[PDB]
Write a protein that binds this ligand. Structure first.
Ligand SMILES: CCCc1ncc(C[n+]2ccccc2C)c(N)n1
Length: 387
């Protein structure tokens, strides 16, 4: 019953994130392929992606539930084709901003990817499905990652052909999304009131708050983990190591996500326990990622953080899906990702951006670990409040 939609969406998400260009993205548009300077790739190109992500998530959670979650995925698939098509044959920064915009489209519609399956499978499978979905996505990345590595370590494949393989993968993902089964069917203040009815669920607003907050710190860690590794071990070869470790970490997260789907354990009573334990694990790993000036210890801490957070976000998505009791799967997922991106952008402005505090990378992860520890303690003091 649930096997065909789950398998098709898992194949889509695998081929929509099996992107060998992703680990070698910055070298691709900063090397001979595009000849863009590094001060226009991060101060003018990536903020465009962030802004497009915000303004494209804004109509995702509003409209994805109404359109039954397939067109936004199909819009994600087509915009994957546009993103990497302009990433392949678009020179200069004028076209690359448009690509950052379409990648914001694909990332905002990635909310539809997660929320579609809960609108097409019964709640009983919401655990298993969840894991698998998240797992395959993470598997996707690490697959692409390791694939990319081999293509640059054994076949000297140029970054342009890495992006070509990425486009071919997301093209197969678009074809799989075309074959996704269509889910069955089903002023402003009222809409907000509906959101209030959609957010008054049991053990969901707190999982939502974790999603709205912990994933912002996770995305900050994702962005600046390579910079932390460069600070810890300024090695010329470390690059091939760095992304590779991400692969393993992502792979770990994959299996961690694959854990949540596979284990026949009840998160109804262990949801709070899993939240507390693995949020404390994330905080401790982030502190370990910073406090210990050992590159191998930092890699292990990053693997632990990524795997535990992937497990936690899988539990969060599953628990929100079962406890939602409203058809708006992508509204809560979409607004969760939008609020998380808002918090991530705000803490990027303060923590690392020149406009804010501009904290060096040797205290960046200190404050990231402090942020995750604050999140965990908030969910510590919630358990004590429950008593
Ligand atoms: C398709 C090319 C456009 C594009 N590709 C990859 C990223 C990856 N990235 C970069 C910085 C911060 C976060 C993330 C996910 C990006 N922002 N933009």
């Amino acid at each position: 019953s649930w096997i065909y939609p789950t398998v098709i969406l898992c194949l889509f998400g695998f081929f929509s994130m099996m992107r060998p260009s992703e680990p070698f993205l910055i070298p691709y548009l900063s090397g001979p392929d595009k000849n863009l300077t590094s001060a226009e790739i991060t101060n003018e190109i990536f903020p465009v992606w962030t802004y497009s992500y915000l303004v494209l998530l804004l109509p995702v959670f509003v409209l994805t539930d109404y359109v039954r979650y397939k067109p936004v995925i199909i819009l994600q698939g087509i915009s994957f084709i546009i993103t990497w098509l302009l990433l392949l044959f678009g020179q200069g920064v004028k076209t690359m901003q448009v690509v950052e915009f379409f990648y914001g489209m694909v990332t905002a519609a990635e909310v539809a990817y997660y929320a579609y399956i809960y609108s097409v499978v019964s709640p009983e499978h919401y655990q298993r499905v969840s894991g698998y979905c998240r797992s395959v996505t993470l598997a996707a990345y690490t697959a692409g990652s390791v694939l990319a590595q081999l293509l640059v370590s054994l076949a000297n494949m140029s970054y342009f052909y890495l992006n070509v393989i990425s486009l071919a993968s997301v093209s197969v993902a678009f074809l799989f999304s075309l074959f996704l089964p269509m889910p069955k069917k089903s002023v402003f203040v009222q809409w907000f009131q509906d959101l209030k009815e959609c957010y008054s669920s049991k053990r969901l607003f707190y999982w939502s708050l974790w999603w709205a907050f912990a994933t912002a710190g996770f995305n900050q860690v994702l962005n600046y983990v390579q910079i932390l590794w460069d600070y810890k071990a300024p090695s010329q070869d470390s690059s091939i190591y760095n992304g590779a470790v991400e692969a393993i970490a992502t792979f770990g997260g994959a299996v961690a996500a694959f854990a949540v789907g596979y284990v026949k354990v009840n998160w109804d009573l262990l949801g709070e326990l899993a939240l507390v334990v693995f949020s404390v694990v994330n905080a401790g790993s982030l502190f370990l990622m910073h406090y210990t000036a050992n590159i191998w210890a930092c890699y292990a801490g990053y693997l632990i953080f990524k795997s535990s957070y992937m497990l936690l976000i899988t539990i969060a998505v599953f628990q929100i899906a079962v406890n939602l009791n409203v058809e708006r799967y992508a509204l809560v997922f979409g607004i969760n990702t939008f609020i998380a991106l808002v918090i991530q952008t705000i803490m990027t402005v303060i923590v690392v951006d020149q406009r804010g505090l501009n904290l060096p990378v040797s205290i960046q992860f200190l404050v990231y670990g402090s942020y995750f520890a604050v999140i965990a303690g908030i969910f510590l003091m919630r358990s004590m409040y429950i008593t």
